[PDB]
Amino acid sequence: PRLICINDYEQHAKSVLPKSIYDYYRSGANDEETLADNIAAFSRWKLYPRMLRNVAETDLSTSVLGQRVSMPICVGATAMQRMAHVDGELATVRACQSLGTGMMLSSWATSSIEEVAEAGPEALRWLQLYIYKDREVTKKLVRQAEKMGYKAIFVTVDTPYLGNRLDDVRNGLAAYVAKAIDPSISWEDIKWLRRLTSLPIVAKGILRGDDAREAVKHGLNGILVSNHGARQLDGVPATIDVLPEIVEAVEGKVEVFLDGGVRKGTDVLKALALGAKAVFVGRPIVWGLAFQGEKGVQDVLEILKEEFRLAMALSGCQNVKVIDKTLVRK
Template sequence: MTLSSWTTSSVEEVASTGPGIRFFQLYVYKDRNVVVQLVRRAERAGFKAIVLTVDTPRLGRREADIKNRFTLPPYLTLKNFEGLDLGKMDRINDPGLASYAASQNDQSLSWKDVKWLQTITSLPILVKGVITAEDARLAIQAGAAGIIVSNHGARQLDYVPATIMALEEVVKAAQGRVPVFLDGGVRRGTDVFKALALGASGIFIGRPVVFSLAAEGEAGVRKVLQMLRDEFELTMALSGCRSLKEITRNHIVTDWDPPRAAGALARL
């Protein structure tokens, strides 16, 4: 589970819920002392990695938030920032988190910040928001321990490619030096299968968990995770794969592939 910096539950609250592997999603702020404090708290709470968000030096134009006049309800706050010298929480107003992010995010974010983070934590640093081979190579050169192919739920910049379309390019650029993960657009077990076949080391899901939580609470989340697992196992069985290692690129046909015999599982 990857916990956002902008969550309404603190790292300590989430850590107290029981065992599990947890990563901390970090944004880099103008006040680097705030970054240090957040990283230290994540370390003390037992989080296993820092997920550095690199595609949000500025918040995208999120028209749904503007249309819906999104604001946090008065009974919710960004818990990870309580007690920190980061300005008043009431700066979070229409349109949502935009004014807060614009006032606090460091727009000069660069690859040097990956190296700087390595000086303040021994946790592995995963770079989230990479969708090109060039950025994958730069991330690895900067010392990233892993890459998450992500377009921020398609909420940052219109017309960026779907992550499944960008995945193979990034995997090839990484050349096995670091694990490459994917998030975005995963709705079925077949989506997980396709991502693994294209070289992903693992898959993150977001909206299915949020939607199921809203609909049926914890039971809903358990149900959606089981659905994805069942669909994935069925896909493996019907594709003749007895283990994850047997899921290969040959199971996928893409529009950029040269023509070949039919029989692959899916066309992207």
């Protein structure tokens, strides 16, 4: 069928995936208050476009942690991509290479670090890391990322335990993940990881300014403002609503990124107006895989790219450097 926006990709995925797999991907934690809010919050921020600026030649390119990208829209870590499409993470990395954007690989990816680097040798690639109770396997992942040309580590800090998604309980794996992830992870473990690698490290899952300041103090290189796609603690705010406090807190010392609820080009524009360098998408990528593997991911990323180009042009922004805080008001 004819899919023209990200919601059409979700609707198609619901129509072709087994219910248990669609529910795993769609679900948030508990009553899904934050899942609704990640989307509703973007709608509350209103755009104040400038007219007559000359937007004939819109340039979406930017950089993430010193590496050039084609657009401020990157693929976030999502476990279990092979349940959406046989090609899983290799399909995703091939789409990212085509688009000129970066892929954050889950540390629970079915495809190995090496396999993804072999499928996307020229793709910008980052590794998402959990600090596992087994620090030997944690270290081995970081060293493999270094050796295979990955350009940053995104350490997930909001998952001492996995969240309670009610459909997953109504429909093994979760127990095996709980056995592996360390609930004792502290700032001392961040000091260890900062000593372990010279790669840029981003703290993924920060929601408070004081924690963002502590990440800067520990010599990390970025914050990804994230509520884990509303899958961890329900009743946290929308990421777009905490973004301004986090940008204020880090005083320009490190790049700030956002995920959670990005579905449209205007969502990207609002996040950049509030000070994010770039945004990451989770579920939209899975819906792309479910439609048509590599070509479906490419289509989702091209829809977001073109929606973002149009939103930039209609708001009077030739390039991402002129996106400013006066474009948005809540």
